[PDB]
Design a protein around this ligand. Structure first.
Ligand SMILES: Cc1cn([C@H]2C[C@H](OP(=O)(O)O)[C@@H](COP(=O)(O)O)O2)c(=O)[nH]c1=O
Ligand SMILES: [Ca+2]
Length: 125
C-alpha cells in the first residue's frame, strides 16, 4: 500500500515542481500525473497551497520514485489535501505523464478533471 511520509517545503518552483527537504537532504520534487501550464495562476495556486500548509507529506507511488532529472515523483499533501488533485479540480492542471506503474491515483484525478471541465474552470473556460 502507499503511505505518506513527512517532508519540509524549501521553495515552490512553479505549478507542479518544488524543492523539499526530504530525510535531511534538499531535493527537487515533481507532482505525479499532472501538468500545469494559466501558467502564472497555476504557479500561484500551488505556491499558496504549499506555503500556507502547516504539514507537507510525500506519498511515492508503487514504481520509480525519481525521474530522469533526479526529481522525486510523488503525490504531495498540504495539511492532508492532495495538491495534485487540488490543481486538477480547479482546471489549473491536466492529467498528464501517466507512466505505469505510477498510476495509483489516476482515476481519482481523472474524475476531478472531468468536474473542472464540466464546470468550465480556468483551462476549460
Ligand atoms: C511527471 C513526470 C514527468 N516526467 C518527465 C517527462 C518530461 O520529460 P521531457 O523533459 O523529456 O519532456 C518532463 C516534464 O516535466 P515538466 O513538466 O516539469 O517540464 O519530466 C517523468 O519522467 N516522470 C513523471 O512522472
Ligand atoms: Ca509542467
Amino acid at each position: 500500500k502507499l503511505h505518506k511520509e513527512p517532508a519540509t517545503l524549501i521553495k515552490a518552483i512553479d505549478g507542479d515542481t518544488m524543492k523539499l527537504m526530504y530525510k535531511g537532504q534538499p531535493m527537487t520534487f515533481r507532482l505525479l500525473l499532472v501538468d500545469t501550464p494559466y501558467g502564472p495562476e497555476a504557479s500561484a495556486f500551488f505556491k499558496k497551497m504549499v506555503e500556507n500548509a502547516k504539514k507537507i507529506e510525500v506519498e511515492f507511488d508503487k514504481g520509480q520514485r525519481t525521474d530522469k532529472y533526479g526529481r522525486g515523483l510523488a503525490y504531495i499533501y498540504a495539511d492532508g489535501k492532495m495538491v495534485n488533485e487540488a490543481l486538477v479540480r480547479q482546471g489549473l492542471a491536466k492529467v498528464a505523464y501517466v507512466y505505469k506503474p505510477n498510476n495509483t491515483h489516476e482515476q481519482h484525478l481523472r474524475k476531478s478533471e472531468a468536474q473542472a471541465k464540466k464546470e468550465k474552470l480556468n483551462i476549460w473556460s
